[PDB]
Amino acid sequence: GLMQFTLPVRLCKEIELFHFDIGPFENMWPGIFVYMVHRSCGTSCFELEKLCRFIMSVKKNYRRVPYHNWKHAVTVAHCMYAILQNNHTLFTDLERKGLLIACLCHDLDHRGFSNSYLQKFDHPLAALYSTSTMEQHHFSQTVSILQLEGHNIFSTLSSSEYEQVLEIIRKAIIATDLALYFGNRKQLEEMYQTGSLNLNNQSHRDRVIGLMMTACDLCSVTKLWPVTKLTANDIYAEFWAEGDEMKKLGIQPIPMMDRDKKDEVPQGQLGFYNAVAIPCYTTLTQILPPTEPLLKACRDNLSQWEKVIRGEE
Ligand SMILES: COc1c(C)cnc(CSc2nc3cc4c(cc3[nH]2)CCN4)c1C
Numbered sequence: 001g002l003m004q005f006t007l008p009v010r011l012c013k014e015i016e017l018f019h020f021d022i023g024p025f026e027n028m029w030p031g032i033f034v035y036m037v038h039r040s041c042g043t044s045c046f047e048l049e050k051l052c053r054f055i056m057s058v059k060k061n062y063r064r065v066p067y068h069n070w071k072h073a074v075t076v077a078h079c080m081y082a083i084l085q086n087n088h089t090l091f092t093d094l095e096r097k098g099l100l101i102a103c104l105c106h107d108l109d110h111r112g113f114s115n116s117y118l119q120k121f122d123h124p125l126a127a128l129y130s131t132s133t134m135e136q137h138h139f140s141q142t143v144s145i146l147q148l149e150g151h152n153i154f155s156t157l158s159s160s161e162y163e164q165v166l167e168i169i170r171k172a173i174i175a176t177d178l179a180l181y182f183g184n185r186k187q188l189e190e191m192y193q194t195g196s197l198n199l200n201n202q203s204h205r206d207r208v209i210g211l212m213m214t215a216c217d218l219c220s221v222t223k224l225w226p227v228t229k230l231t232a233n234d235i236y237a238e239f240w241a242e243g244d245e246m247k248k249l250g251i252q253p254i255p256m257m258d259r260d261k262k263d264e265v266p267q268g269q270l271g272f273y274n275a276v277a278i279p280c281y282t283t284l285t286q287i288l289p290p291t292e293p294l295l296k297a298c299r300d301n302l303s304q305w306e307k308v309i310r311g312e313e
């Protein structure tokens with residue numbers, strides 16, 4: 001009960017900042033996550049023994065892929081931690097419990113391939129889950145691990161609270177399907193301007209949590225430039241392998257996944273910041289003003305990609 005996780009001074013201070021990088025020491029990531037759960041939720045939210053066993057089973061069910069790996073899971077959880085800590089009073093006890101777990105689990109058993117590749121390959125998961133294929137898989141994996149003996153971190157919840165938190169997690173994980181982000185942000189943009197946005201309306205909260213999940217999932221674009229640039233290398237390592245596998249099926253991949261179009265990456269990134277990232281953090285900042293540092297960091301990185309194109313780097 002009295003056992004706190006502590007971090008070295010530099011990590012203790014920087015972990016509170018949106019642009020924190022969790023570092024290259026994999027063995028510290030579980031402790032970083034438990035630290036964030038303790039400060040965000042409470043030292044009593046989870047039985048420490050069950051939490052530690054949950055964390056290690058989740059880690060084991062992430063694969064050795066360049067980007068959609070265990071580091072991404074903990075990185076996405078840290079961005080959610082930073083949102084929750086800067087918006088202390090806006091979220092329920094169940095939501096803070098659920099969302100850190102949802103973020104840690106949101107890409108469970110990812111193979112390094114898009115929903116589109118699974119469909120074109122005719123992968124079994126594409127038959128089981130016609131839409132948001134991988135995201136329904138990630139939620140399935142989350143429930144499977146929760147049901148292992150000694151892993152039910154939610155055991156001390158009542159039946160209705162347990163059903164509520166699993167529903168928060170399901171919606172949160174499905175929301176990481178970027179195909180669904182565009183419509184979700186459009187609806188939130190309309191509701192915020194016409195002034196009809198109401199955080200007591202459950203279907204409105206779901207939308208806002210949806211946007212928070214997209215914002216955490218894309219948080220690579222909100223880091224300092226050297227982190228953003230080096231993370232991009234891992235993203236393209238995965239995408240270009242998928243493009244290769246598309247060519248193996250006799251399908252020309254979209255240029256984003258084609259290693260032969262490396263040269264156009266800087267222009268591709270501009271389109272991504274202008275079409276996805278900036279709008280995402282703009283709407284989030286309008287709904288949750290204290291998340292503004294994410295938007296500022298994103299605009300800084302858009303400026304860096306513009307400098308790459310102009311040959312200044
Ligand atoms: C996972 O989200 C991210 C993040 C965080 C950063 N970067 C990206 C890549 S966005 C993107 N990269 C591209 C490269 C090329 C084209 C379009 C692109 N769109 C046409 C020519 N080549 C994604 C998808």
Ligand SMILES: [Mg+2]
Nearest residue numbers: 106107176177
């Ligand atoms: Mg995903």
Ligand SMILES: [Zn+2]
Nearest residue numbers: 106107176217
């Ligand atoms: Zn993800």
